[PDB]
Amino acid sequence: EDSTDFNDKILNEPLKHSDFFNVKELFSVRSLFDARVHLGHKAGCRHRFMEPYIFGSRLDHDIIDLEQTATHLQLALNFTAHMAYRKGIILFISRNRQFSYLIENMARDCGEYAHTRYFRGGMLTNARLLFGPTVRLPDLIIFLHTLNNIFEPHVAVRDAAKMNIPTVGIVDTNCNPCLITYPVPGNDDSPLAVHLYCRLFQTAITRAKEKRQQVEALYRLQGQK
Amino acid sequence: AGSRLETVGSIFSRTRDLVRAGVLKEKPLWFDVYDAFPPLREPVFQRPRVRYGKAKAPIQDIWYHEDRIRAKFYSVYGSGQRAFDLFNPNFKSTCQRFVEKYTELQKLGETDEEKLFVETGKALLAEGVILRRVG
Amino acid sequence: NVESFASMLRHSPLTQMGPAKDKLVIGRIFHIVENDLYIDFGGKFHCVCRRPEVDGEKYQKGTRVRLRLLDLELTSRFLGATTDTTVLEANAVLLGIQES
């Protein structure tokens, strides 16, 4: 009898509301513009699959349409908040050595996990052998940088697609958003933009966890009486 | 438990089909969230084919009416001693001030570009802005 | 009534800068590795400039300097490269310290 009401009133309650966690408050187009999110690489480095998200080139410098970025970021933050609310494992991945410390620190602070080092072969496709069969794979992977240091797509994207793990991702003008479940077109090299992404994701995850705790406490209190 | 055919469909399609087929006893945690709030584009793998022939990328070049004035000003005067403070969103460069004055004078009804340029330069010189010429 | 993205892009100082060639900008030294200074100037990428032989110790983290920009992004297309190859940094000349 406990499950029949617990499952509904906790798990399925946020799924009815469009924005349960009010992630739209966190960011604004003005804020993204101030964080230099719209900047992209030169037209030569452009990846064709990123053409729909490119507003236009400013003197052979692609500008990322922040109108589309706002909607994509809304979807991605809402998805991340819902996954955190369901206590799913969230793994940040970014091989960019500049932000490795910041990303690891943010992941540790928000209670989620980070992998900013050399992604060993089969860390996901061979996780059962590398960790023991009882290991629990991440339920959501967030790429703050979808390219490795040789500018090829991160192998973790393909591996997560193989293991059916949804991927939130910051795709730049030269990135490949084909297999990323929730692409977020935006600048991934500017320190301001990366800091903005880290703040937004940390805030969404923390809000989701706090809301989960509050809802669990309220449901347990009301069920007793 | 699961299909590793990332080149066939999306994770959502594969998971839904496997659940329908009964291979996956229980839906994954993310499945309900994806169903409630799907992304704008289904994450289906696509090969990035190279363009050929008359095909061309539809990316436009960001040009404005003030671009002509900016080019003319930078040709005549170039980069002034006042550097660019791009860290300031409210920054107004010397070229930006010239463009603003040109727009103000154009709103007055004048239409000659090569005369409005000189009039704007005279007005800014009266304002005291340094307008050293390149040569 | 909220400003649209198009308006922000139109009135952005980076847009007003036009071409980045030989433009004068004010950057900040946000990192130092021996005699190499990493300067952010409001662009997408930073720039690495050698510490000047004169007054080199006067450059420290947070020091504001004047730069002559050559290119915001250093990219090149090689033989057989389908896409441009970039070094993820800008090209600028370090004029020297800037004083308010």
Partner: peptide, 26 residues
């Protein structure tokens, strides 16, 4: 639909081609 949208025109900042020293001379 809005004035702030970019307009289509030839690159105004395009610097002229570096003509050879004898170009235009007989």
């Amino acid at each position: 639909s809005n004035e702030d949208l970019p307009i289509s025109m030839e690159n105004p900042y395009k610097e002229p081609l570096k003509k050879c020293i004898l170009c235009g001379k007989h």
